[PDB]
Motif scaffolding. Sequence first.
Motif, PDB file in Angstrom:
ATOM      1  N   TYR C  18      11.249  16.838   1.804  1.00 47.87           N
ATOM      2  CA  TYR C  18      11.912  15.401   2.420  1.00 47.87           C
ATOM      3  C   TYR C  18      12.975  15.107   1.083  1.00 47.87           C
ATOM      4  CZ  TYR C  18      11.722  10.955   1.664  1.00 47.87           C
ATOM      5  OH  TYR C  18      11.836   8.666   1.576  1.00 47.87           O
ATOM      6  N   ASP C  39      12.363   3.702  -3.108  1.00 47.56           N
ATOM      7  CA  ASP C  39      11.526   2.771  -2.198  1.00 47.56           C
ATOM      8  C   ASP C  39      10.087   3.368  -2.328  1.00 47.56           C
ATOM      9  OD1 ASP C  39      12.662   0.218  -1.777  1.00 47.56           O
ATOM     10  OD2 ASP C  39      11.209   1.299  -0.077  1.00 47.56           O
ATOM     11  N   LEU C  41       8.447   2.524   0.629  1.00 47.84           N
ATOM     12  CA  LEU C  41       8.622   3.151   2.483  1.00 47.84           C
ATOM     13  C   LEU C  41       9.099   4.554   2.011  1.00 47.84           C
ATOM     14  CD1 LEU C  41      11.008   0.313   4.065  1.00 47.84           C
ATOM     15  CD2 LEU C  41       7.983   0.483   3.647  1.00 47.84           C
ATOM     16  N   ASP C  42       9.754   4.895   0.711  1.00 45.32           N
ATOM     17  CA  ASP C  42       9.702   6.231   0.609  1.00 45.32           C
ATOM     18  C   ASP C  42       8.185   7.177   0.571  1.00 45.32           C
ATOM     19  OD1 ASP C  42      12.712   6.748   1.254  1.00 45.32           O
ATOM     20  OD2 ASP C  42      13.233   5.607  -0.356  1.00 45.32           O
ATOM     21  N   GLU C  45       6.004   7.088   3.514  1.00 49.49           N
ATOM     22  CA  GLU C  45       6.978   8.495   4.514  1.00 49.49           C
ATOM     23  C   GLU C  45       5.821   9.279   3.961  1.00 49.49           C
ATOM     24  OE1 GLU C  45      10.404   8.215   6.029  1.00 49.49           O
ATOM     25  OE2 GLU C  45      11.489   8.130   3.712  1.00 49.49           O
ATOM     26  N   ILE C  47       3.418   9.944   1.965  1.00 48.43           N
ATOM     27  CA  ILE C  47       1.915  10.202   2.075  1.00 48.43           C
ATOM     28  C   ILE C  47       1.775  10.244   4.033  1.00 48.43           C
ATOM     29  CG2 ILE C  47      -0.254   8.677   2.345  1.00 48.43           C
ATOM     30  CD1 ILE C  47       0.664   9.692  -0.588  1.00 48.43           C
ATOM     31  N   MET C  48       2.833   9.707   4.717  1.00 46.73           N
ATOM     32  CA  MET C  48       2.348  10.268   6.147  1.00 46.73           C
ATOM     33  C   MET C  48       2.930  11.224   6.199  1.00 46.73           C
ATOM     34  SD  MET C  48       3.476   6.911   8.539  1.00 46.73           S
ATOM     35  CE  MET C  48       5.079   6.877   7.025  1.00 46.73           C
ATOM     36  N   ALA C  49       3.741  12.375   5.234  1.00 48.85           N
ATOM     37  CA  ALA C  49       4.478  13.297   5.846  1.00 48.85           C
ATOM     38  C   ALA C  49       2.593  13.939   5.249  1.00 48.85           C
ATOM     39  CB  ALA C  49       5.616  14.283   4.526  1.00 48.85           C
ATOM     40  N   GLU C  51      -0.319  13.291   5.113  1.00 47.77           N
ATOM     41  CA  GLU C  51      -1.010  13.501   6.085  1.00 47.77           C
ATOM     42  C   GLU C  51      -1.399  14.141   7.344  1.00 47.77           C
ATOM     43  OE1 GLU C  51      -1.796   8.948   8.042  1.00 47.77           O
ATOM     44  OE2 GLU C  51      -2.618   8.723   6.331  1.00 47.77           O
ATOM     45  N   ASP C  52       0.329  14.396   7.593  1.00 43.50           N
ATOM     46  CA  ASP C  52       0.702  15.478   8.610  1.00 43.50           C
ATOM     47  C   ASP C  52       0.923  16.575   8.641  1.00 43.50           C
ATOM     48  OD1 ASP C  52       1.997  13.658  10.486  1.00 43.50           O
ATOM     49  OD2 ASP C  52       3.932  14.067   9.477  1.00 43.50           O
ATOM     50  N   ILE C  58      -5.104   9.015   5.439  1.00 40.16           N
ATOM     51  CA  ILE C  58      -5.600   8.495   4.237  1.00 40.16           C
ATOM     52  C   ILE C  58      -5.085   6.627   4.027  1.00 40.16           C
ATOM     53  CG2 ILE C  58      -3.751   8.752   1.676  1.00 40.16           C
ATOM     54  CD1 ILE C  58      -2.884  11.311   1.731  1.00 40.16           C
ATOM     55  N   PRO C  59      -6.539   6.317   3.930  1.00 40.70           N
ATOM     56  CA  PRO C  59      -6.147   4.855   4.309  1.00 40.70           C
ATOM     57  C   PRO C  59      -5.289   4.202   3.310  1.00 40.70           C
ATOM     58  CG  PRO C  59      -8.276   5.133   4.046  1.00 40.70           C
ATOM     59  CD  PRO C  59      -8.183   6.775   3.832  1.00 40.70           C
ATOM     60  N   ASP C  60      -4.873   2.544   3.725  1.00 35.99           N
ATOM     61  CA  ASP C  60      -3.924   1.808   2.712  1.00 35.99           C
ATOM     62  C   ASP C  60      -4.283   1.786   0.819  1.00 35.99           C
ATOM     63  OD1 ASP C  60      -1.867   0.055   3.129  1.00 35.99           O
ATOM     64  OD2 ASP C  60      -2.148  -0.770   1.916  1.00 35.99           O
ATOM     65  N   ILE C  61      -6.091   1.834   0.335  1.00 35.34           N
ATOM     66  CA  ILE C  61      -6.300   0.782  -0.302  1.00 35.34           C
ATOM     67  C   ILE C  61      -6.166   2.610  -1.764  1.00 35.34           C
ATOM     68  CG2 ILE C  61      -7.469  -0.632  -0.109  1.00 35.34           C
ATOM     69  CD1 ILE C  61      -9.481   2.484  -0.578  1.00 35.34           C
ATOM     70  N   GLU C  64      -1.618   3.675  -1.976  1.00 33.27           N
ATOM     71  CA  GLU C  64      -1.001   2.625  -2.907  1.00 33.27           C
ATOM     72  C   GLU C  64      -0.814   3.188  -4.528  1.00 33.27           C
ATOM     73  OE1 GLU C  64       1.094  -0.243  -1.849  1.00 33.27           O
ATOM     74  OE2 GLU C  64       1.736  -0.002  -4.178  1.00 33.27           O
TER      75      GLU C  64
END
Lengths: 96, 208, 82, 113, 114, 176
Positions: C18, C39, C41-42, C45, C47-49, C51-52, C58-61, C64
Amino acid sequence: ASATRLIQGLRNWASGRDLQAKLQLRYQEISKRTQPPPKLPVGPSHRLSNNYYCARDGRREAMPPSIVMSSQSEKKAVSPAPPIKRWELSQDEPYL
Amino acid sequence: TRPTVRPRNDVAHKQLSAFGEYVAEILPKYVQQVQVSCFSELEICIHPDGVIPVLTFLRDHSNAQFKSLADLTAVDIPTRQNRFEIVYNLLSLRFNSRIRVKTYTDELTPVESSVSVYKAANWYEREIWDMFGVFFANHPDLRRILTDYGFEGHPFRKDFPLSGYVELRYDDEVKRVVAEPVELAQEFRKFDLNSPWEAFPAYRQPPE
Amino acid sequence: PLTLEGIKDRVLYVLKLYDKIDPEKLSVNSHFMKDLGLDSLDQVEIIMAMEDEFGFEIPDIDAEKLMCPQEIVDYIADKKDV
Amino acid sequence: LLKKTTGLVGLAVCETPHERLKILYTKILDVLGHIPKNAAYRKYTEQITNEKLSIVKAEPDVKKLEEQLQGGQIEEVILQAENELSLARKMIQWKPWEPLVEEPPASQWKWPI
Amino acid sequence: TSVKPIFSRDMNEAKRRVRELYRAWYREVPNTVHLFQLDISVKQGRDKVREMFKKNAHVTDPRVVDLLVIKGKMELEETINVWKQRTHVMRFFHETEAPRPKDFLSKFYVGHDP
Amino acid sequence: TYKYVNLREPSMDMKSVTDRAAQTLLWTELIRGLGMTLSYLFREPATINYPFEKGPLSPRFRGEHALRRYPSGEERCIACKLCEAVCPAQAITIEAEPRADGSRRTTRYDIDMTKCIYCGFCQEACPVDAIVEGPNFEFSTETHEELLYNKEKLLNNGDKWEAEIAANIQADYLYR
Ligand code: SF4
Ligand code: SF4
């Protein structure tokens, strides 16, 4: 209209209808393209007396809507109108 | 006042007044005003929490049976804090009558969708989303219906200009239809037409 | 996924891929918002990496609360056996 | 006489219309007994439902029952009875005989502005 | 000041919805670059998504960000289901539009707009 | 007051059943349709020989615009801007001034023919019969700005078509 009676007979046989009585092409039965000049009539308000505009003022008889209910016994249940009358079947051609 | 004046229908006025009283007293929880116009059109002005209970009543009650949704309409009136006026024109084929059911919302309060009452509303209030920005809660597929796919702005709001904010053209550099800010070669000419004299004294509002 | 050390090295590898994270200041206990200067949103993304890389959602609760790589390796440890 | 079709698409002919209307009207009244007495929906719906039920109990014919219930075919009278029943079951949950939930703003229905 | 909510009771549920919409757009950008056969990179498209999310980042009203998430979901459904053409995707990249004068002096040079 | 289209029960006697089966197996209505198509084959067609033969128009026809004159050469337009006030598409652009003899005349009379909806509200708003919508419909151009008529073009359309326009107005002015 200029069809020969052999072609006219074949055409009426193939369609099953007398086509010359009701042609879809127009001929001398239509109106002239030059007409006499009209004399169009006038309406009822073209009068010289008893013709005040306040006695025929349509726009100034329109009222604001009558507020029937606002939020600032055994009375009959009503409908917005009487129930609609059942339509009658055609005496002309009911297909019945 | 015979030839040129519209003939007044007093029978329909009395009948729609009686039915407006009827609906106002069956449903006092939501009915705010009831009015009948001079050309005999009944309007039931309700609270927006009673969109479903009033419309389900008029559709299903044996003295109403307003089975048809003729038209569903919003009106932007920016001087009101609830600027959007949602209008339900309904038709009873049994009693051969029409009623108008009117409510209100602002930009942020959702109106309950009436697709459970009238499926006809499925596109109409969808259009009210596209043209006015009124969100409808629990709509099945709520999205735009008339505007272009990337269209920002709700056009039938009265603060939206006549020509928009963008205009399209083909651009041969990018080989693509592009959107640019609108420049008119001739501006739309605003005409101030309203007469400075009072036209209808019956509609005179009381002054401040 | 078998051992915690391989999960930790792989989390740090995803974090150093990243580009906004400075790879020198990237540690195991560094914070995203106030230390790495990111940020939100950083972090999303990131957390999305994760998951990749790790093959689960990974859920939202529970994303965070993931504010450091140690919390990330602990969360990946808790949704697996180790 | 066993009417062949109702004329409306998808509205099937009822073999016994009188018994179905008696069942639906007494079921409407049974649902409608669970509404408070001063509610206008209850008074008006009891009035019209008792009128329709007395018309049904007074007429053995099907055609004359259609021409004096005055709601079209007898099967759409049954459909309206089902609609009134569903409506009254919803009117129990909505409780719309309550006072007005909120007054509008002061110039909300003022036209013109 | 008691208003009816759209989806979110407060701002934290609203930020949850903003975050899930951003996740869905972030996943969608490579598929959008591919099937619309765009001339941008996946990184540039994700930059445009981040720019459009940061454009609205000052809103404090839960209902306004609920409508922003609703409109973002609508644009996302118009992108996934191929309802937009290439032109609607490329309208986020104002490419044929010439760059506007930003400082005072060039706006003075070109005309009258403040 | 209503009738039932398609509420016929077909007869089930052997005669009518065999009629329907001869229809099914011997294609009788298909030969009926071939007969009607063959019947139009031997009719004279309705095709006029354009451009040598023309479609019939009336004197009310709303085609190309023309500014007219009096029978002295003076242009009828006295710059009152009623036509551009009524113009539903805002196609008419008018600027005026007093000219050298003090007369109220236009200096600009533009009609965008690609905004124009050809409804003729201008020629009925006009109090002096200045703007008319004449009888020309064959005025297709090769360029868009050739359909942006100024006052010179409209006065030349008036001078071009006036012998026809005056006779059409002579035919229809007692209906107006
Ligand atoms: S015909 Fe109609 S649209 Fe055309 S210039 Fe006249 S008023 Fe305008
Ligand atoms: S053409 Fe007629 S309506 Fe138009 S400005 Fe001239 S005089 Fe007035």
